[PDB]
Design an enzyme around this catalytic site. Structure first.
Site, PDB file in Angstrom:
ATOM      1  N   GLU A   1     -12.472 -17.511 -37.876  1.00 14.06           N
ATOM      2  CA  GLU A   1     -12.142 -17.018 -39.212  1.00 14.06           C
ATOM      3  C   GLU A   1     -10.692 -17.447 -39.574  1.00 14.06           C
ATOM      4  O   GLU A   1      -9.825 -17.396 -38.735  1.00 14.06           O
ATOM      5  CB  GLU A   1     -12.265 -15.486 -39.210  1.00 14.06           C
ATOM      6  CG  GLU A   1     -11.682 -14.740 -40.461  1.00 14.06           C
ATOM      7  CD  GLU A   1     -12.378 -15.140 -41.758  1.00 14.06           C
ATOM      8  OE1 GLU A   1     -13.636 -15.014 -41.822  1.00 14.06           O
ATOM      9  OE2 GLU A   1     -11.673 -15.620 -42.676  1.00 14.06           O
TER      10      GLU A   1
ATOM     11  N   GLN B   1      -6.628 -15.914 -50.234  1.00 11.39           N
ATOM     12  CA  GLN B   1      -7.614 -15.570 -51.270  1.00 11.39           C
ATOM     13  C   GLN B   1      -7.394 -14.180 -51.789  1.00 11.39           C
ATOM     14  O   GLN B   1      -6.690 -13.388 -51.168  1.00 11.39           O
ATOM     15  CB  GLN B   1      -9.062 -15.663 -50.739  1.00 11.39           C
ATOM     16  CG  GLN B   1      -9.375 -14.821 -49.535  1.00 11.39           C
ATOM     17  CD  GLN B   1     -10.511 -15.415 -48.671  1.00 11.39           C
ATOM     18  OE1 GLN B   1     -11.482 -15.981 -49.182  1.00 11.39           O
ATOM     19  NE2 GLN B   1     -10.400 -15.245 -47.375  1.00 11.39           N
TER      20      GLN B   1
ATOM     21  N   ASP C   1     -21.099 -19.308 -41.838  1.00 10.33           N
ATOM     22  CA  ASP C   1     -21.154 -18.227 -42.820  1.00 10.33           C
ATOM     23  C   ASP C   1     -19.920 -18.342 -43.752  1.00 10.33           C
ATOM     24  O   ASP C   1     -18.879 -17.659 -43.568  1.00 10.33           O
ATOM     25  CB  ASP C   1     -21.190 -16.906 -42.069  1.00 10.33           C
ATOM     26  CG  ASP C   1     -21.133 -15.705 -42.969  1.00 10.33           C
ATOM     27  OD1 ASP C   1     -21.548 -15.802 -44.147  1.00 10.33           O
ATOM     28  OD2 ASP C   1     -20.671 -14.646 -42.481  1.00 10.33           O
ATOM     29  N   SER C   2     -20.051 -19.198 -44.763  1.00  9.10           N
ATOM     30  CA  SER C   2     -18.888 -19.653 -45.517  1.00  9.10           C
ATOM     31  C   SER C   2     -18.556 -18.838 -46.767  1.00  9.10           C
ATOM     32  O   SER C   2     -19.449 -18.276 -47.424  1.00  9.10           O
ATOM     33  CB  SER C   2     -19.042 -21.135 -45.890  1.00  9.10           C
ATOM     34  OG  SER C   2     -20.103 -21.314 -46.816  1.00  9.10           O
ATOM     35  N   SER C   3     -17.255 -18.787 -47.075  1.00 13.17           N
ATOM     36  CA  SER C   3     -16.735 -18.322 -48.359  1.00 13.17           C
ATOM     37  C   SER C   3     -17.175 -19.356 -49.424  1.00 13.17           C
ATOM     38  O   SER C   3     -18.029 -20.210 -49.143  1.00 13.17           O
ATOM     39  CB  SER C   3     -15.204 -18.190 -48.242  1.00 13.17           C
ATOM     40  OG  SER C   3     -14.599 -17.536 -49.344  1.00 13.17           O
ATOM     41  N   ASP C   4     -16.633 -19.302 -50.637  1.00 14.43           N
ATOM     42  CA  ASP C   4     -17.113 -20.218 -51.687  1.00 14.43           C
ATOM     43  C   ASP C   4     -16.212 -21.438 -51.969  1.00 14.43           C
ATOM     44  O   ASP C   4     -14.997 -21.361 -51.763  1.00 14.43           O
ATOM     45  CB  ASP C   4     -17.485 -19.446 -52.963  1.00 14.43           C
ATOM     46  CG  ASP C   4     -18.898 -18.853 -52.896  1.00 14.43           C
ATOM     47  OD1 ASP C   4     -19.253 -18.251 -51.846  1.00 14.43           O
ATOM     48  OD2 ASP C   4     -19.640 -18.981 -53.898  1.00 14.43           O
TER      49      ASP C   4
ATOM     50  N   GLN D   1     -27.676 -11.801 -43.327  1.00  9.07           N
ATOM     51  CA  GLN D   1     -27.103 -11.696 -41.953  1.00  9.07           C
ATOM     52  C   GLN D   1     -28.192 -11.986 -40.915  1.00  9.07           C
ATOM     53  O   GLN D   1     -28.029 -12.799 -40.025  1.00  9.07           O
ATOM     54  CB  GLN D   1     -26.476 -10.304 -41.688  1.00  9.07           C
ATOM     55  CG  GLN D   1     -24.900 -10.223 -41.848  1.00  9.07           C
ATOM     56  CD  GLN D   1     -24.368 -10.858 -43.124  1.00  9.07           C
ATOM     57  OE1 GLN D   1     -23.597 -11.828 -43.079  1.00  9.07           O
ATOM     58  NE2 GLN D   1     -24.766 -10.309 -44.279  1.00  9.07           N
TER      59      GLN D   1
ATOM     60  N   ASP E   1     -16.613 -10.562 -42.046  1.00  7.30           N
ATOM     61  CA  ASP E   1     -17.104  -9.170 -42.119  1.00  7.30           C
ATOM     62  C   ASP E   1     -17.695  -8.708 -40.787  1.00  7.30           C
ATOM     63  O   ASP E   1     -17.799  -7.520 -40.566  1.00  7.30           O
ATOM     64  CB  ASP E   1     -18.096  -8.983 -43.266  1.00  7.30           C
ATOM     65  CG  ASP E   1     -19.209  -9.998 -43.213  1.00  7.30           C
ATOM     66  OD1 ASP E   1     -19.970 -10.035 -42.220  1.00  7.30           O
ATOM     67  OD2 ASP E   1     -19.291 -10.797 -44.145  1.00  7.30           O
TER      68      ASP E   1
HETATM   69  C1  LIG Z   1     -16.953 -12.665 -45.708  1.00  8.44           C
HETATM   70  S1  LIG Z   1     -17.960 -13.945 -44.927  1.00  8.44           S
HETATM   71  C2  LIG Z   1     -19.283 -14.131 -46.165  1.00  8.44           C
HETATM   72  C3  LIG Z   1     -20.060 -12.853 -46.451  1.00  8.44           C
HETATM   73  C4  LIG Z   1     -21.441 -12.883 -45.827  1.00  8.44           C
HETATM   74  N1  LIG Z   1     -21.319 -12.533 -44.419  1.00  8.44           N
HETATM   75  C5  LIG Z   1     -17.094 -15.504 -45.404  1.00  8.44           C
HETATM   76  C6  LIG Z   1     -15.795 -15.813 -44.647  1.00  8.44           C
HETATM   77  O1  LIG Z   1     -15.423 -17.200 -44.544  1.00  8.44           O
HETATM   78  C7  LIG Z   1     -14.013 -17.286 -44.367  1.00  8.44           C
HETATM   79  N2  LIG Z   1     -13.542 -18.690 -44.557  1.00  8.44           N
HETATM   80  C8  LIG Z   1     -13.412 -19.367 -45.738  1.00  8.44           C
HETATM   81  N3  LIG Z   1     -12.980 -20.625 -45.485  1.00  8.44           N
HETATM   82  C9  LIG Z   1     -12.893 -20.787 -44.148  1.00  8.44           C
HETATM   83  C10 LIG Z   1     -12.509 -21.854 -43.347  1.00  8.44           C
HETATM   84  N4  LIG Z   1     -12.172 -23.030 -43.868  1.00  8.44           N
HETATM   85  N5  LIG Z   1     -12.481 -21.678 -41.972  1.00  8.44           N
HETATM   86  C11 LIG Z   1     -12.848 -20.483 -41.386  1.00  8.44           C
HETATM   87  N6  LIG Z   1     -13.205 -19.431 -42.188  1.00  8.44           N
HETATM   88  C12 LIG Z   1     -13.238 -19.569 -43.548  1.00  8.44           C
HETATM   89  C13 LIG Z   1     -13.499 -16.240 -45.347  1.00  8.44           C
HETATM   90  O2  LIG Z   1     -12.175 -15.880 -44.982  1.00  8.44           O
HETATM   91  C14 LIG Z   1     -14.556 -15.127 -45.224  1.00  8.44           C
HETATM   92  O3  LIG Z   1     -14.207 -14.211 -44.213  1.00  8.44           O
END
Ligand SMILES: C[S@@H](CCCN)C[C@H]1O[C@@H](n2cnc3c(N)ncnc32)[C@H](O)[C@@H]1O
Ligand SMILES: C[S@@H](CCCN)C[C@H]1O[C@@H](n2cnc3c(N)ncnc32)[C@H](O)[C@@H]1O
EC number: 2.5.1.16
Lengths: 285, 274
Positions: free
Chosen positions: A110, A35, A159-162, A66, A90
């Site tokens: 992660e 990403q 706690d997912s990315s988009d 959080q 994070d």
């Molecule tokens: C930064 S954190 C979100 C901010 C609010 N605490 C979201 C994290 O999800 C991870 N992420 C995204 N997809 C996945 C999958 N499939 N698996 C594990 N982690 C993931 C991505 O690398 C960010 O670090």
């Protein structure tokens, strides 16, 4: 990306609206294997993490999401000892989870080690979570990771990315059954949900899917200026038919709230977080 | 507007901004009092802007309009005489007149041009003005408030320290008021001061908020004051049945929402209570 001292967050998932944050300094902008990673010092929100152009967090308001994503499920379980975090690069959710004396082990999966490195430098108030002795850090796609586990965890937090990018695998409905299998007999989960002001239709679908898997399913939300429309929701599922998400099974005393240095969450906040606007209440019930 | 987008900047929320994508500019003229800008947005319907500040969008106006009327109206055992200050768009009026107990609603709006633009471009809000309960007054609501003594059960300020004493004098014995308040994510320090000020004038003062994507930081607060020392703002003295919420065509407010609206995040609870 940054134009005339401002960064504007646009996305087809919230069409026709945008938050802009004023930029004091670009701090970091590099593509990982997974990403695009952008960090800047904003004028009024402290440091800001951006993943594939979507704001992940700001130092100013991080605390509400959080604390809520951590304490909603933890306080809804009588004795959570083994916790799983999917995502969380994070370190902020970890920070909040490890505060609970019952939690002995926190596994974090992660996918992107670069997000971890960057957060350790630029999000110190969040990445303090990585100093906990309770952490097992794991690398990989949390979807495939979930398959490894069975009757393992008391609490799973996503706690997912988009939706685009690497988090798409976490958006497959099968993930929820994977989580049910990974959970102990009476375990609970909490995932980042949709904004009830942006995607109520998806919340309704997701709730009906989860209801088919789990005896107890709930939606809650918190406010946070720097997510789209200024708030976000959480999906909560329990394998325990007696779980009442709305009334914390572990109420926190004011002493505990103070000791935990909470800035958003407390037990009343917990309860009120399930009281939705009439339009959303109507749609889900 | 620039590149097809309207960006709302203001020094009172520094370093941050909402932009809304414009489908069509609809109206842009200065009145005696303020710059008035109306546009059809891509996803929020029509948008009214006064002096660069977003006042309302057709998509999300229901949250604020419902909350500012029902918070005080449902905290009064029999509100019959109502006063609205501002309210140019008609929306708060729309919400107030739904209450059978309400017999008269006086509305004092300074700017007659806002009323005319809202009647044209905000029809779902300006339906308020078709009520037979309305007495429309023109002028500065400040000097207007001076004319009144022991007159209103409820005063709502739908706005763009002395004013609060004037409202208290204008209220009946057990009268209540609701004023647009500050955003707790933006100006908690000002909420704390205003609360301490009101607490010096009124036996009961409370702060509630609602969510609304197109106000700064995605929400706004309300100052609630009562001259009745028994008033419990947090627990509605007039609860609504599901049937009432239904008939009233409420999209945001109900009695549980009323209660929860007073439950503040810890940082604000601490600052307003501790
Ligand atoms: C930064 S954190 C979100 C901010 C609010 N605490 C979201 C994290 O999800 C991870 N992420 C995204 N997809 C996945 C999958 N499939 N698996 C594990 N982690 C993931 C991505 O690398 C960010 O670090
Ligand atoms: C548009 S309404 C706010 C939008 C949510 N209902 C704000 C109104 O307050 C009026 N206003 C502003 N100042 C005053 C004074 N001093 N007095 C009365 N009305 C006022 C202004 O013209 C708008 O119509």
């Amino acid at each position: 990306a940054i134009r005339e001292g401002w960064f504007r967050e646009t996305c087809s998932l919230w069409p026709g609206q945008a938050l802009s944050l004023q930029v004091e300094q670009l701090l970091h902008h590099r593509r990982s294997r997974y990403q695009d990673i952008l960090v800047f010092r904003s004028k009024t929100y402290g440091n800001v993490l951006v993943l594939d152009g979507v704001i992940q967090c700001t130092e100013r308001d991080e605390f509400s999401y959080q604390e809520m994503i951590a304490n909603l499920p933890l306080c809804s379980h009588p004795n959570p000892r083994k916790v799983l975090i999917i995502g969380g690069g994070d370190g902020g959710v970890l920070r909040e989870v490890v505060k609970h004396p019952s939690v002995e082990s926190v596994v974090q999966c992660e996918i992107d080690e670069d997000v971890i490195q960057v957060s350790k430098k630029f999000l110190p108030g969040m990445a303090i979570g990585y100093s906990s002795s309770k952490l097992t850090l794991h690398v990989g796609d949390g979807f495939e990771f979930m398959k490894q586990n069975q009757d393992a965890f008391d609490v799973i937090i996503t706690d997912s990315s988009d939706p685009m990018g690497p988090a798409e695998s976490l958006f497959k409905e099968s993930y929820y059954q994977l989580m049910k299998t990974a959970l102990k007999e009476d375990g609970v989960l909490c995932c980042q949900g949709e904004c009830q002001w942006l995607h109520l239709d998806l919340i309704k679908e997701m709730r009906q899917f989860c209801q088919s898997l789990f005896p107890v399913v709930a939606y809650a939300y918190c406010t946070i200026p720097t997510y789209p429309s200024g708030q976000i929701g959480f999906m909560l599922c329990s394998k325990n038919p007696s779980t009442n998400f709305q009334e914390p099974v572990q109420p926190l005393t004011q002493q505990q709230v103070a000791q935990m240095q909470l800035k958003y969450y407390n037990s009343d906040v917990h309860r009120a977080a399930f009281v939705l606007p009439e339009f959303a209440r109507k749609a889900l019930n």
